[model samples]
Target: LMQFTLPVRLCKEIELFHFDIGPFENMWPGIFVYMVHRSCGTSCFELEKLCRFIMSVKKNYRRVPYHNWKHAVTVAHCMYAILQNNHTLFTDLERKGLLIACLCHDLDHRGFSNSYLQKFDHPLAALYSTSTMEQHHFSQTVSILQLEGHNIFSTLSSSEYEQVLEIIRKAIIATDLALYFGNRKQLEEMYQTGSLNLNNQSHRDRVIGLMMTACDLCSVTKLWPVTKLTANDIYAEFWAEGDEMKKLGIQPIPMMDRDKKDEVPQGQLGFYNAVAIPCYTTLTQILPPTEPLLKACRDNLSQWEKVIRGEE
Candidate 1:
């Protein structure tokens, strides 16, 4: 079983960073951490239940290469940092809502990309209806949390729980690859109009919904060694999935595997530049570190650019 141990400094540093970006009252390192610390007070009960759910995901699901427990934690951390920087852009409940959504976003990712989930008729697709892994993760997380408490939000009133649920649904659903075109379409409208008004957008909608999608697709904006590791995982998992397909007489697609055609790293570089850079560039102010990462991605692109169409 892959266990997750976060750096304590990241917790303290991130909590301080997020809290500063608000007129907010409640703040914690993250929803998972919040759950653990929930044992300390009335607030901790539901949160601790949530923590147990997160642990279940870590234990039950194993996503190969990238999007593992580590990526889940890293994304939660990055989302926290991004939310902190764009504080003026989110609401209090929205912040909490997003952190909760982000923590459970890729809850039980199984190394394979969304493509695999779709093409292969995986159970997650059947259960989730093929849009957002985060939402699927939420359903599973909340279900798991229910084992501890009938409602994961007994600490809150019905109305408050509804509000949190509303906040979480939007953020989680935003991870849907099926909505990629729609997401990009809305972003274009927002960018061209230069107004946040993409249709009576809420503070939570603009920041959490839009930005959570950004973080999920932030590989183009990956931070060096982190990106290196992520890219490797993506290729390995894709190929592994492809290998399974090949055994079944199914024709493999691009990301499914390299099919003995190596140079996977370079292929991913193109993916980063074309798809990822455009998406991430829109939120540089909120995710400032992404700028340098993109540049480094370009400079380092050549490193992966060459391929003999054979294995390394």
Candidate 2:
């Protein structure tokens, strides 16, 4: 079930910094293999086992509107593009960890938020007091690793294996937007005060956390058409949750209320200004090579502004 042959066409396009794999959904597994090889090479991970591992990961994602396998692949692709430009910023192990973490960040997402799970007293919420879904994502990552023939990191030394798992764990948990909000101020202050030290583990961890958020929300940095489509999907997912909440005698937030569809442009504008814009702006400041992301984000923000102004 793990066998996949990489298409000759994908091998070349996947290497391009701006390549978008959205249109080639059927080829995600092969594209994933190409990315793994490009980022980590085959020296540390066996090709056959890696294929099995990625296929398993793919299967684990639920058919949610936004946080499904496509979202995972796109987030991983964004990380791949970022690393290609800023390869010198992180160690090889860091790069591998980031790639793997992005690929599995939303494993088995059920089209609901952590708050929803907690409020509903879900078993997963009880399992993790905070970052409920994220902790599960990391746990699922570990579970996949333990499966026979799916141990992609098998060749690593004992110490290296543990370190990689640590990286993956932290990175996956950092994808939680709640954590992002909590950590954003410290990161901004560190960069602004000129105290951001790349060598310091704490400082570096914060930056890695920011990188995870940036990649996870990278849809806002795409062109307007693509961004619009992704936004629709996101709202679809959110409204799905909203519908469920209403049936349980809860009022959904304005953003999740399908009846508030006309307010989407305004809601998106708020999200971009408050979350997406600052995210890419901080990233660009810390890593000058990420300026393009900031640029695209601003462009999309203006597009949303125009929509709100009835200019679109």
Candidate 3:
């Protein structure tokens, strides 16, 4: 349903870490086309089908500040960068599943976290019970795939289709930040025991979940300008949720309160130190090629620290 104008030949030149990939709308189609073409060896009819599916998915993303189409595309592009840099680390099927899952992970998001939805007893919260939004997103992914002319995986054998869908489902749910701690703990233990074997399907799938998280929060590993924009967008969403919470007789946390915008620098620093930095560091432990991403996160941490110190 959309035209991908990025010169296919030049697609490899795109780098997700660079700030110039800032235009989320323009970058999405091009990079998605590249990912599909590269991973699925898709061309002509298949490529067109994928483009339609992507745009359809993008269109379904509600007009939310943070979990909008742009954020989804950014995550997908981040996965693209990782897969590109570590091309030999995974099979083509794994790469495709990762890309597609990232693209659709936040499908039909309503700018509300699971906690927010549950507090008000939203229908989706009742339906999913755990990882609410993520489960809804996976359901949406299947529904979209079933639509006319949208099943891009139709060319694959039935078994292959099921396999890829399984990976995609696991990956989409893995994006939940609530699952990060336990997942990271398991992976750290595996790394410490030297049992993080990529050849083992279970180990490989778990690491894929880890990488999924890494890419989900990839903005922290990007240039500062990019990080700043991303932070602002997320806060806007948080504050909007806070506004709604107040009307519902609930008080939001300090970070979600619009009146506490001044606390952002310190909040950013804490989040970087506690969540972003440690997660990236652990990911680097398992994948040496991802060390640069951790370095970028550290740099961004320092930037936030300087802001908190009134250096900016």
User: Best-fitting candidate, measured by lDDT?
Assistant: 2
The sequence of per-residue lDDT tens digits that candidate 2 reaches over residues 1-312 is 233346677667655534568676777877776676667665646777877888899999998889999999989988887887786788878877888999999998999999889878899998899999999999999999999998887777899889999989999999999889868889889888999999998888899898899989989888789899999999998998889889888998888899999889989989998999889888888888878888988899999999988999
- Candidate 3 residues 1-312, lDDT tens each? 444446543554465444235464656677667666655455433766777898899889998888988778778777777776777888767876888898899999988889899998899987999999999999999999999999887867899889999999999988998998889999999999988788998888788888889988888988788788889999989999999889889999888899999889988888987789889889989888888789999999999988878898
Query: Candidate 1, residue 201: CA error in Å?
Result: 3.2
Scanning candidate 3 in windows of ten residues, the lowest lDDT window is 15-24
lDDT of each: 0.57, 0.86, 0.83
Candidate 1 per-residue lDDT over residues 171-192, each given as its tens digit: 7777765565566666566656
Highest-TM-score candidate: 2
TM-score of each: 0.73, 0.94, 0.93
Candidate 1 wrong stretches, greater than 4 Å:
1-54, 113-119, 122-128, 132-135, 149-152, 202-207, 285-312
Which residue runs does candidate 2 get wrong by more than 4 Å? 1-18
Q: Could you tell me how far off, in angstroms, the CA of residue 89 lies in candidate 3 after the best superposition?
A: 1.6
Between candidates 2 and 3, the TM-score winner = 2
Instruction: Supply candidate 1's per-residue lDDT for 138.
Output: 71
Q: Per-residue lDDT for 67 in model 1? A: 62
Q: Rank by lDDT, highest first.
A: 2, 3, 1
Cα deviation at 67, candidate 1, in Å, is 2.9
What TM-score number comes out for model 1?
A: 0.73
